[PDB]
Amino acid sequence: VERTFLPNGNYNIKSIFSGSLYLNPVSKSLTFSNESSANNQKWNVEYMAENRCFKISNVAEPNKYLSYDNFGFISLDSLSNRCYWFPIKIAVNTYIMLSLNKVNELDYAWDIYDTNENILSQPLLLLPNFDIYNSNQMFKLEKI
């Protein structure tokens, strides 16, 4: 039963820079790659009532969640308070994804670097967030 603006379930995750690139793990990093139709591009979003956040696990590795490391990268790890995400919906299914925890006493958010809107081979990082207008912090969650 629905508690929030983002229903529980399986999603693809995309950067607004590209409608043809999909979030998946590559080694220990997260990156956006060509469509594979595989489970590793599928993400299970689950609302957590107690803290009003979302945990997001990889369907191919369902005991691993999107988290972040001590080096500024998003990671795929076992459950911890680093796995709680606080989304800000800014358009149809466009979101900014804040870490639940303040980091370095700021909001920090998923951030993908672009070179003239090209994100190929970039790792997804966790970087400061100041507002809702940073294109590198905008992500599409597409139910599928």
Binding site: G72, N104, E105, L106, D107, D111, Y113, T115, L127, P128, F130, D131, N136
Partner: protein, 286 residues
């Protein structure tokens, strides 16, 4: 520590005509003013290995560049030695520019909004908007400055080239002629300046050392003559007064002959003693 206590201007690699400018706690980007509103003292803390950037404002004397966390805004606030008032000066070698990162959070660096004309914090990228030129304020003020040069013994007279063909240099009453104006240019390699007379294209103030103490204008396509280059050192307590010493032999200072103030008086070099006839006001032509 090679930068500790240095007074600098900071301008934008993205728009080299824009300088960090301070008034009443507001930092903005503004055209060159050649005055304290665009001057900043770099203050080094060796433990943090980071710098405070202190405004040389004459009225509020303890303002330092401050990141207004958690926003991305920048201002000048009273110096409390806080981490959000410290900055890493990271010199991008080969590009002659600096990335200026927050010591409190080095994920974030200064970014020049050249259309709002102010500064904010930003994550890094490869644009010139995060790159700055930090320069000794004297070099900054004088480099490419077209000036007139007067002895402090009489500010109504100027050092001039006689005319376009007569390359001699003497003292004359200011009459607004181009032979009475000089464009200063800093030579990065030599760490020295030339004074180009504006009546010519390639003529520079030169010590004619093969003729004792004479100074004349000659061509700057004579290339390795240190006698064409000068050190320009401010005199304490003054805004416009300088001693001017020759690069070939720094003991040789630009010198008003005798301290005589009459029209036609020789400009020469002489051994430096710092008397009033070896002090010069470098000024805007009105």
């Amino acid at each position: 520590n090679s930068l500790n206590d240095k007074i600098v201007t900071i301008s934008c690699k993205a728009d080299t005509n824009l300088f960090f400018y301070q008034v009443a706690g507001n930092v903005s980007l503004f055209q060159q003013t050649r005055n304290y509103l665009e001057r900043w003292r770099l203050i080094y803390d060796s433990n943090k290995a980071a710098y405070k950037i202190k405004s040389m404002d004459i009225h509020n004397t303890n303002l330092v560049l401050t990141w207004n966390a958690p926003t991305h805004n920048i201002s000048t606030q009273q110096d409390s030695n806080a981490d959000n008032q410290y900055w890493l000066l990271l010199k991008d070698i080969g590009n002659n520019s600096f990335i200026i990162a927050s010591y409190k959070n080095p994920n974030l660096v200064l970014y020049a909004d050249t259309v709002a004309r102010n500064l904010k914090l930003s994550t890094l990228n490869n644009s010139n908007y995060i790159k700055f030129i930090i320069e000794d304020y004297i070099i900054s003020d004088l480099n490419n400055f077209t000036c007139k040069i007067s002895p402090i013994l009489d500010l109504n007279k100027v050092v001039q080239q006689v005319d376009v063909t007569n390359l001699n240099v003497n003292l004359y009453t200011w009459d607004y002629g181009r032979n009475q104006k000089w464009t200063i240019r800093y030579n990065e390699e030599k760490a020295a300046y030339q004074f180009f007379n504006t009546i010519l294209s390639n003529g520079v103030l030169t010590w004619i050392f093969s003729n004792g103490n004479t100074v004349r204008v000659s061509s700057s396509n004579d290339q390795n003559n240190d006698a064409q280059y000068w050190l320009i050192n401010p005199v304490s307590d003054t805004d416009e007064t300088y001693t001017i010493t020759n690069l070939r032999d720094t003991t040789k200072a630009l010198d008003l002959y005798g301290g005589q103030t009459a029209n036609g008086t020789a400009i020469q070099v002489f051994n430096y003693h710092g008397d009033d006839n070896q002090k010069w006001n470098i000024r805007n032509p009105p």
